[PDB]
Amino acid sequence: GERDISINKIPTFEGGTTGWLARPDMFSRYDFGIEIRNRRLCHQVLGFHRLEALNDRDVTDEIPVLVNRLTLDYDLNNSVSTLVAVRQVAYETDGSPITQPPLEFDYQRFDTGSIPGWQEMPQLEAFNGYQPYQM
Amino acid sequence: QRRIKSVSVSLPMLVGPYEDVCAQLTQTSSSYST
């Protein structure tokens, strides 16, 4: 998310100084006996060609062209994030984007607005309550 | 020799935490005695 995620901006090989974001749902691992903070998730991936060097023609300031831009979109929640979609993009020399069809996803969202009411347990109805239970 | 000391008895049924367990018992006779 450093370079402008806008479809109407082709990114650049240099990223400026906006700085890479940290995910909403940050945490750590521990399992190797150490702190293991987990923070960065990617949203754009970029193919760069050093055109005039590829031409063997020129090398001064051959800042590579962004050939194509994979673009990646996530659902974000306080405890998780994961892809809503991806899409392939390329760019006209006037900088107009051209697009492939996107590709969507929807993993099972935990929700508790869902949650329904109670029911009794005729199958069990007395077999607990301190000592009356074992399992 | 052989003779009775005492005895107890029970039922498994989970009547409820304190519900009405209720019954009566007696020997009609220990026909042999003494």
Q: Interface of chain A against chain B, CB under 8 Å?
A: 126-127, 129-130, 132
**Cα–Cα distances in angstroms (integers) from residue A15 to residues A44, A48, A82, B2, in the given order:** 12, 13, 24, 100
CA dist., res. A81 & res. A40, Å (int): 11
Evaluate the CA torsion angle A30, A32, A35, A36 in order and state its sign.
Answer: negative
Identify whether the C-beta of residue A45 lies closer than 8 Å to the C-beta of residue A70.
yes
Q: What DSSP element (H or E) covers A127? A: none
Header resolution in angstroms: 6.4
DSSP A98-126: EE---EE-------STT-------TTTTT
Amino acid making up residue A33: G
Burial (CB < 10 A; 0-12, 13-18, 19+), residue A124, is exposed
Q: Does B12 touch chain A if contact means CB atoms closer than 8 Å?
A: no
List, in sequence order, every beta strand (DSSP E) within A1-135. 27-29, 36-38, 44-49, 65-76, 81-91, 97-99, 103-104
Of chain B, the end-to-end C-alpha distance in Å amounts to: 11
Identify whether the C-beta of residue A76 lies closer than 8 Å to the C-beta of residue A24.
yes
A-B contacts at Cβ under 8 angstroms: 8
Nearest-by-CA chain B residue for A124: B14
DSSP state of A63: P
Nearest-by-CA chain A residue for B16: A126
CA dist., res. A29 & res. A39, Å (int): 11
Does the beta-carbon distance from B17 to A129 stay under 8 Å? yes
Q: Does B14 touch chain A if contact means CB atoms closer than 8 Å?
A: yes
Residues 6+ apart with CB under 8 A from B27: none
**Cα–Cα distances in angstroms (integers) from residue A75 to residues A104, A108, A125, B1, B21, in the given order:** 11, 12, 42, 85, 59
